[model samples]
Target: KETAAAKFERQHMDSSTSAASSSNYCNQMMKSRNLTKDRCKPVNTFVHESLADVQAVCSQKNVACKNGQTNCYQSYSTMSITDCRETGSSKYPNCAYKTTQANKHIIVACEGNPYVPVHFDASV
Candidate 1:
């Protein structure tokens, strides 16, 4: 079974996407990564940093979860990230995306024994 950490990595991490500078980046990746399972993920972000750097954010300064949960943390260092959003024309299996790359501090939700990132909340 894929662990929660592993699932998070598949849906959110893309260290090799440093060259994803085009608008098609997300459309290709989100589909290829299975994030378009049932419906396209409306908004998602992929980190261009290493897994270790992302895990370290779990110990970063604490922050409030978007929905009032207490397990969120904010990254102290700005990270290279790709923000993928639906372009409205994206319907069901026909997913279209607007890919944008940016450097920002990210917010993540963590859980479990090793205290690793589980949900990618958003970027700030």
Candidate 2:
């Protein structure tokens, strides 16, 4: 198992040429704050297992449902589901009605971002 710190570094802080801009942003934040290297934890990224898994949790928690449906199929910026289909698809598959155990990533977000970072479980 990966430690949260490890996951943060590998996913967010670790530098790649492709992420030069992001690295610069983080570095600037660190320097301005007088922080040391390895002091910051990067944000976490996650994939939701199936649409239903996301829906069930959101509904049970009373999080707003997209399209006025208790169940969700896709998420938008508001974390609401869009384009629901009663019948499952090959491209966008559905899972069993019963809930299953899935791993979800935890994200810490900046304030006023509208949607909170969610623990997205990726499975089907």
Candidate 3:
């Protein structure tokens, strides 16, 4: 079994070379979504380690705001929620502040077999 540091090193190495390819893939994905932005944040390079941490933080925030009826959705790395109070207010309209978390550090390869390169072992 590889230690955390070893795994991180290997993943980083793979990521450095895979970045250009991954950028193209991300741009295409965003284009398909009709997004004009050519750059996509590379946050999922750490995979499980980072994703788990994000989920935990979101969960804690949700729990803390249980009385406020806060909700969180893990939709492709974006953490967002809606509340009734945030709908509309006379004094402060558009007071709702929807937040989104950046993608985790999970490197994705867009070339070769399967189209999506299975480099980082995020499954583990």
Candidate 4:
């Protein structure tokens, strides 16, 4: 079974690339990561940062999640990221997306014994 840490990494991590310059990046990435297997994911974000840097956010100051959970933490500094939004004409099995790259402080929920990111809350 895929662990939460693994899933978080799969869904959000893009360490090698600093930007999603290609317009097709989201369509390919979202599908490749299995976020578009059943239904097109409405929205998603990919962080272009190192695993250790992202993991360290788990130990930063804690904040309330959008869902009201108190285990969330925000990145200490802005990080490069690509936001993927489903296109209007996106259809199941053939998901489409629009990508927007930005640098922002990200918020994520952490858990487990090692306390790693389990969920991506948002970017601000």
Candidate 5:
């Protein structure tokens, strides 16, 4: 039985990313990573930093979660990440996404395991 924290790892963790400069990255990841579930997740971000580094964000300063959870936290350092956004042409059951990579401070609504991020809120 996997916890939501573990489920989060499956969807948003990429231990190491290679030279995937093509735009198809989002399309490929969304499906391969199993995010194309009951519905497309609309937007998601994958951290490219070490899993331990990513986990450390939970101890950073607290921020107001956009979803209004009191457990939200923001990363103090800019970390590498990949952003996936649903494209207009995307249709359900056949989702499509636009991929982009950047170094940005991440904002997440965290819960459980206290110092580990679970729900991906956004990137700031």
Candidate 6:
């Protein structure tokens, strides 16, 4: 099994191409990433930057996490990203989402000896 860091990558990172203009992007990505298996994830975001670029955020200045932990950092550069939010009519086993894209400096929580990203906090 993968660690929380790895799971974060699997669930949020998308280093390759993007389909921001496609109405089905969230539908396809959510299913493919296993976020729609048992229940519809209320919201999720995918980063369109390389792993190394995202990982480097760990070395940026520290900030407080959403839950008030102090291990979070904000990326120095604005990154391309897509956010998927569940539709009002979404239901279990038949998830639906609204796709939105943006470029912003992202915040994430890092941990461990090497200090890699484990949770995405926000984008600004």
Q: How many collisions per candidate?
A: 0, 4, 9, 0, 0, 0
Alpha carbon lDDT of residue 117, candidate 6?
95
**Candidate 5: misplaced stretches above 4 Å?**
18-20
> Candidate 4: lDDT of 65?
99
Better of 1 and 5 by TM-score: 1
- TM-score of each model, in listed order: 0.93, 0.19, 0.20, 0.97, 0.88, 0.94
| lDDT per residue (tens digit) for residues 20-80 in model 5 | 3678988988898889988988998888878788788888979988866688888999888
After the best TM-score superposition of candidate 1, give how far the Cα of residue 40 lies from its true spot, in angstroms.
1.6
Per-residue lDDT for 29 in model 1? Answer: 91
Tens digits of per-residue lDDT, candidate 1, 31-116, equal 98899998888988899999999999999989999999999999999999988889878898899998888899999999998999
How do the residues 51-102 of candidate 3 rate in per-residue lDDT, one tens digit apiece? 3333333323222122333332222432221111111221221122222223
Model 6 TM-score is 0.94
Off by over 4 Å in 2: 1-41, 62-124
**How does model 3 score by TM-score?**
0.20
What's the best-to-worst order under TM-score? Answer: 4, 6, 1, 5, 3, 2
Regions of candidate 1 where Cα sits further than 4 Å from its true position: none
Report the Cα lDDT for residue 105, model 4.
Answer: 95
Q: Return the TM-score for candidate 1, rounded to 2 decimals.
A: 0.93
Clashes by residue pair, model 6: none
Choose the strongest candidate by lDDT: 4
Which of 1 and 3 is the better model by lDDT? 1
The per-model lDDT (C-alpha) reads 0.91, 0.28, 0.28, 0.94, 0.83, 0.90
Q: What lDDT tens digits, residue by residue, belong to model 6 across residues 6-30?
A: 8999888998855376878889999
lDDT of 2 by residue, 1-124 (tens): 9553343233333222222233234334333333223433222222323333333333233332333433222332232111111212212121111112223222222112233223332112
Residue 89 of model 2, lDDT score: 23
